[PDB]
Amino acid sequence: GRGDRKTAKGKRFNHSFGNARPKNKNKGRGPPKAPIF
Amino acid sequence: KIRIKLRSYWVPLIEDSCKQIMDAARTTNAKIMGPVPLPTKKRIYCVLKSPHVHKDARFHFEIRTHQRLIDILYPTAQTIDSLMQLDLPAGVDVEVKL
């Protein structure tokens, strides 16, 4: 939710930066999901 | 070619001081850009009111920095001496830039 600091909404609540809430979206990202078909 | 900045905490002093600087600058020389009021740098402070424990009911006062940009076009020698003739305003901070 918002304390879930391993998420994006959690880091947005915590006023911090990590994988899920990136600065400069070109640079820095976790592994990308591949649902494919 | 010159930009002078007028900052104060008091509106009749920038009004009257910029009034007379625009007056002298117009009556001594040629066409000069008017005073553009660029907005109020205004900022607030919350003071805990009672000395001891009363966390509610505080006193937040706000300081207001008024400022006007005013631009004189052409540097003429008796016009530079006209502006530097007037060391008139009581506190109003005046700055010079190109």
Partner: protein, 110 residues
Amino acid sequence: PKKGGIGHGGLQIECIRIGGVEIPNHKRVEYSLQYIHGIGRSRSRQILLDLNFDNKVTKDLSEEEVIILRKEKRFNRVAIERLKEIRCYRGIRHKLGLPVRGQRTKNNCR
């Protein structure tokens, strides 16, 4: 299916199902959808056996189910050995990221 030692997940979506395994790495779950290029959204049903071989190898490549239980309890018998404040607060079951314990420590007060 069944994965490495004994542990295995249900018959659900594949990324979630690997999450159901005891102790894998969720970023390396996401990498196990990328190096193997496994289709994550498809369930644990409809998986070719070569994909199961690749899964069992890549899950052998990182520490898992029994192994991390073994090494963490090795740091717990380490956390019997050398008389530390972490160890002293595990004789008495407190919290060691240090909350203020004057109130409300009931992950361990139970």
